[PDB]
Structures are given as C-alpha cells and as structure tokens.
Amino acid sequence: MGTKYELRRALEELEKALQELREMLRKLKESLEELKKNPSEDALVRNNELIVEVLRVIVEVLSIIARVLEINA
Amino acid sequence: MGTKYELRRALEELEKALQELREMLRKLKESLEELKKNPSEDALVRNNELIVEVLRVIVEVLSIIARVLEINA
Amino acid sequence: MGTKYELRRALEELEKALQELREMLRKLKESLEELKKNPSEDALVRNNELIVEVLRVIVEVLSIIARVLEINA
Numbered sequence: 001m002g003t004k005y006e007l008r009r010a011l012e013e014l015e016k017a018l019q020e021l022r023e024m025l026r027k028l029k030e031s032l033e034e035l036k037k038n039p040s041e042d043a044l045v046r047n048n049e050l051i052v053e054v055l056r057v058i059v060e061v062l063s064i065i066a067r068v069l070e071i072n073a
Numbered sequence: 074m075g076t077k078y079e080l081r082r083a084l085e086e087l088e089k090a091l092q093e094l095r096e097m098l099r100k101l102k103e104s105l106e107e108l109k110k111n112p113s114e115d116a117l118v119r120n121n122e123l124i125v126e127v128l129r130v131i132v133e134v135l136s137i138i139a140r141v142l143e144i145n146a
Numbered sequence: 147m148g149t150k151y152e153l154r155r156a157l158e159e160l161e162k163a164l165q166e167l168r169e170m171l172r173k174l175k176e177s178l179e180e181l182k183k184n185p186s187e188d189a190l191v192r193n194n195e196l197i198v199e200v201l202r203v204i205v206e207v208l209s210i211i212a213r214v215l216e217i218n219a
Contacts (some may be wrong), residue, residue, distance in 0.1 A: 007146065014139050021132050028125050039118050045185050047121055048193055052174050054128055055200055059167050061135055062207055066160050068142050069214050073153065080219065087212050094205050101198050112191050120194055127201055134208055141215050 003071060010068050017061050024054050076144060083141050090134050097127050149217060156214050163207050170200050 031047050104120050177193050 011139070011143055014142070018132070018136055018139060021135070025129060025132060028128065032122060032125050035118055035121065039114055041114065041185055041187065041190070044114070044117055044121065044190055045181055048181065048190065048197070049178060051121070051124060051128070051197060052178050055174065055197070055204075056171060058128075058131060058135070058204060059164070059171060062167070062204070062211075063164055065135075065138055065142070065211055066157070066164060069160070069211070070157055072145070072218070084212070084216055087215070091205070091209055091212060094208070098202060098205060101201065105195060105198050108191055108194065112187055114187065117187070117190055117194065124194070124197060124201070131201075131204060131208070138208075138211055138215070145218070 006071060007068065010064055010071075014061065014064050014068075017057055017064070021054065021057050021061070024050065024057070028054065079144060080141065083137055083144075087134065087137050087141075090130055090137070094127065094130050094134070097123065097130070101127065152217060153214065156210055156217075160207065160210050160214075163203055163210070167200065167203050167207070170196065170203070174200065 028047070028050050031043075031050060035043050035047055101120070101123050104116075104123060108116050108120055174193070174196050177189075177196060181189050181193055
C-alpha cells in the first residue's frame with residue numbers, strides 16, 4: 001500500500017467529511033432560523049445537539065489533516 | 074494563473090479567515106461571560122447564533138486547507 | 147533552529163491539541179446526554195461553555211495548520 005495510497009485515501013476521506021459538514025451546516029442554519037423565530041429550551045437542546053455533531057466531524061477532519069501533514073513534511 | 078497563484082491566493086484567504094475567526098471568538102467570550110452572569114433563553118439563542126457563525130467559517134477554512142493539500146501532495 | 151525545528155514543534159503541538167480536543171469532546175458528549183435527559187437553562191449554559199472551549203482550540207489548531215502550510219508550500 002504505502003505512502004501514495006495513504007495520501008489518496010486521506011484526501012478522499014477529507015472531501016467526504018467536508019460534504020457531510022456542509023450538509024450538517026445546512027441543518028444548523030435551518031434550525032437556527034426556527035430558533036430565532038421561536039425560541040425555546042427544547043429547541044435549544046436540538047440545536048446544541050447538531051453543534052456537537054458538527055464538532056465531532058471537524059475534529060475528525062483535523063485528525064486527517066494532521067496525518068497528511070505528517071506524511072508529507 | 075496556475076499553481077503558485079492558487080497557493081498564494083489560498084494562503085492569503087486562510088489568514089484572513091483566521092483573523093475573522095479570532096474576532097468572532099472575542100465576541101463569543103464576551104457573550105459567554107454575560108451568559109454566565111445572567112443566564113437567559115434569549116441570551117442563549119444570541120450565543121448559539123455566534124457559534125454557528127464560527128462553524129461556518131471553520132468549514133470554509135477546512136475547505137481551503139483541503140485544497141492546498143490537494144494541490145501540493 | 148530554523149525550518150525543520152519549526153515543523154517538528156508545530157506537528158508536536160498539533161497532536162497535543164488534538165488529544166485535548168478528543169478529551170473535550172468526551173465531556174461534551176457526556177454533558178449532551180445529561181442535557182437530553184434533563185433539559186435545563188443552566189445546563190445549557192455549561193454546555194455552551196464547553197462548546198466555546200472546543201472552538202478556541204480548533205482555531206488554535208487551524209493557526210498551526212496554516213503555519214505548516216505556509217512553511218512548506
């Protein structure tokens with residue numbers, strides 16, 4: 001397998017995650033606007049839930065970036 | 074135009090976005106401390122709003138990072 | 147010192163921050179689930195607090211990534 005493979009797999013996953021993240025962002029915006037219109041505790045809690053969802057994937061992405069940077073140098 | 078240009082433009086935008094993000098972070102901290110002092114539903118909603126704002130820009134930054142990594146390899 | 151040192155220090159800090167971020171994520175998940183079980187304004191405020199905590203470190207990480215990319219080119 002080796003290095004080029006690693007790279008290619010990593011960048012592949014990178015773009016996949018970004019599209020997930022642009023998707024999740026779409027939902028946040030939707031939620032946020034419902035929020036702004038109709039504030040509510042329970043609505044705050046579904047919103048924070050999506051936020052954490054987003055954070056998880058960002059961290060994943062950063063983990064992948066670090067690996068690419070480590071491999072290339 | 075080509076490759077070096079692309080790179081230079083990308084890194085330029087990268088740093089611009091970071092300063093935006095350090096700026097937005099300043100506002101979050103301010104908001105957060107008002108929050109911690111004076112909890113409130115509506116204050117929670119302005120806070121979550123800034124959070125999403127921050128997330129949008131992070132995703133943008135990551136999109137730019139991916140592109141740089143893709144170009145250099 | 148110079149370039150290789152810079153790189154090595156940067157990647158070192160990168161991984162340190164990621165482990166911090168995976169740690170903070172663990173706490174968010176814990177908090178989030180308490181939230182989902184027991185919604186509350188004050189619980190929302192401790193949650194948003196961890197969120198901002200996470201954001202700070204992400205921004206830091208991105209600052210480090212940018213620097214690596216700038217150095218390597």
